[PDB]
A paper describes a structure:
Afterwards, the [name] [name] phosphorylates choline in the cytoplasm to form phosphocholine, which is further activated into CDP-choline by the phosphocholine cytidylyl transferase LicC. Therefore, the [name] [name] is crucial due to its role in initiating phosphorylcholine metabolism pathway. Here we determined the crystal structures of apo-form [name] at 1.94 Å (apo-[name]) and two complex forms with choline ([name]-choline) and AMP/MES ([name]-AMP-MES) at 2.01 Å and 1.45 Å, respectively. The structure of [name] adopts a protein kinase-like fold which comprises of an N-terminal domain (residues 1–92) and a C-terminal domain (residues 93–283).
Each asymmetric unit contains two molecules of [name]. The interface between the two molecules is about 650 Å2, which is not large enough to maintain a stable dimer. In fact, [name] exists as a monomer in solution, which was confirmed by gel-filtration chromatography. The overall structures of two molecules are very similar with a root-mean-square deviation (RMSD) of 0.4 Å over 280 Cα atoms, thus we took molecule A for further structural analyses. Three structures presented the snapshots of the conformational change in the active site upon substrate binding and products release. In the apo-form state, the enzyme adopts an open conformation (1), with the P-loop protruding outwards from a wider active-site pocket. Despite no metal observed in the three structures, we propose that the activity of [name] is dependent on Mg2+, as deprivation of metal ions using ethylenediaminetetraacetic acid (EDTA) drastically diminished its activity by 6 fold.
Author numbering:
A (entry chain A): -1 to 13, 18 to 283
B (entry chain B): -1 to 13, 19 to 283
Write the structure that this text describes.
């Protein structure tokens, strides 16, 4: 297999490869390389995700955040090749929408650490600008019902956020539960910092809550772990960022599906939840 | 009788049909009906010194004037234990029901005071305020299981410190009846006797608690109030509700030691702190 061979030549500089396995997620460009000694996570990136992710920026941000010890080790990051190679924590457990709700005392400290880090990431996340970005990148008509009316309801939140005050801190930006992994010592790592950018920390909170479908009670309990003098909490900003997230990810989905991918109902389901969020708000 | 006769011989230097005794959390307030104007006559003395620094109150009245939130004060005579205010004729005094229709008016008033940047005389340190009442109370505190409840309340000091405590000009006493609607349409916020430096969440907690806001009403009000300059912490609000019920329950014990009778006000406020501690 040619893909199998390419991986062997990309990682031999770090060494007896016994196995290469295709990994899921939301990018088919992920592989697991098993060696005699160690196991490696091999990530590819080429054409589609450029125009989305600045890889030079990502490389800087990886180097930047290393001392926080939140992410796993990165061995290789070569933009030329389009190759990323990370440490694979063997016998580590990936969190999901159920198990994440048992880990508040570990997740809250992780989020406090990044949000209060004073780290200056390359990249600013300006959600309305991001919406404009995806709109520009999408070639066909956006397939979602009532889009022009929804878009304009969403854009009315910009003034609201401005009135509420927008903070600018280092954020992960993509707190799906599978981005948390627990090692045997019970240490939680937060991985996959590809979208990471300066933003309001309430974005990260909204993402955590939304991706795992936190109940109102679970949100309040999590906020009691998280809220502090250095980490203030705005419930309204969270509600607004949930809508912006559903909007942005639904558009991301349309773009990705034009670039080859198929995510079933993922896009429409997120879009419709944005519409519901707008009606409740 | 003699009450009418002190009032005339005090408010005379401002110019008298009748005089009426007003209800509430005091029996020392009087309505003086005058030919041209209506007056609120407020008496204080020994029963409220050691609680209210009347010199600081007078300074604070002066400092807060440019906000234009309170009614006109004509006379503030400390030496004589007498305060005289404008009374707003044909005003609507808000209550726990009507206050909930006035969010678009109340929220900017609270924003105006909280962002005033004014340095009032008086710091409101709630745990120090609890220690103060305990010292002032001469008989035992009658509230059941007080030691254990007080220990629980004092555990909130560290939590508040972890959350961060802000220090701003606050009204400190947001009973609905302190909001007055003029027939002209404007709202007045009156009775600034307790006003001092505190976290603005104390004021929000007082507003919510004194008028028994529902969760939804609180949420709606917060949407009017929350801004970059006036951030909101729900947890801090829940904590200040407990501290308020505790402090006012103790204030009640102190006042009743002077012979005043608030019925079940004190114990009900105490139990609401107890119940707040259990829910928290």
């Amino acid at each position: 297999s040619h893909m199998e061979k390419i991986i062997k030549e990309k990682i031999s500089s770090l060494l007896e490869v016994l196995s290469v396995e295709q990994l899921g997620g939301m990018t088919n460009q992920n592989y697991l390389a098993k060696t005699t000694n160690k196991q490696y996570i091999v990530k590819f990136f080429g054409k589609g995700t450029e125009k989305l992710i600045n890889r030079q920026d990502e490389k800087y941000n990886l180097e930047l955040l290393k001392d926080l010890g939140l992410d796993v080790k990165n061995y290789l990051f070569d933009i030329e090749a389009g190759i990323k190679v990370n440490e694979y924590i063997e016998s580590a457990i990936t969190l999901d929408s159920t198990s994440i709700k048992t880990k508040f005392d570990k997740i809250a400290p992780i989020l406090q650490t990044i949000h209060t880090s004073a780290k200056e990431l390359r990249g600013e996340f300006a959600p309305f600008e991001e919406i404009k970005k995806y709109e520009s990148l999408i070639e066909e008509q956006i397939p979602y019902a009532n889009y022009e009316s929804v878009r304009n309801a969403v854009f009315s939140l910009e003034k609201r956020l401005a009135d509420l005050g927008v903070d600018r801190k280092s954020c992960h930006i993509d707190l799906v539960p599978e981005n948390f992994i627990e090692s045997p010592q019970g240490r939680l790592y937060l991985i996959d910092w590809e979208y990471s950018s300066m933003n309001d920390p309430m974005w990260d909170l909204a993402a955590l809550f939304l991706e795992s479908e936190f109940t109102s009670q679970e949100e309040e309990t999590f906020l009691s772990h998280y809220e502090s003098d250095q980490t203030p909490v705005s419930h309204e900003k969270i509600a607004i960022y949930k809508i912006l997230q559903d909007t942005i990810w639904s558009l991301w989905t349309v773009y990705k599906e034009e670039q080859g991918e198929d995510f079933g109902d993922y896009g429409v389901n997120r879009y419709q939840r944005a519409v519901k969020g707008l009606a409740s708000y």
